[PDB]
């Protein structure tokens, strides 16, 4: 039970490093590198 909870949490954290088809997996870099009209698409991909 403990290992199941820990591994579920670990996979949840590791999902933050996936690009999800966007340019990058970190929000700050893409927000500072893309104009907001274009960055809407990448932020939306990260959101979903």
């Amino acid at each position: 039970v403990v290992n199941h909870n820990a591994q579920a949490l670990n996979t949840l954290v590791k999902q933050l490093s996936s690009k999800f088809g966007a340019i990058s997996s970190v929000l700050n870099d893409i927000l500072s590198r893309l104009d907001p009209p274009e960055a809407e698409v990448q932020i939306d991909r990260l959101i979903t």
Partner: protein, 49 residues
Amino acid sequence: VLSFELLHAPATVCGPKKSTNLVKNKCVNFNFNGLTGTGVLTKSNKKFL
């Protein structure tokens, strides 16, 4: 064409040179070579190559 590599390497070109004196043990926003983010910066005892 203009090609760049936005990857985790020591940046050689940095654009307009703006430097603010680094503070420690305080909640600040850091922009080290485009590494935008927020946090508390404390000196570390790692073994960076």
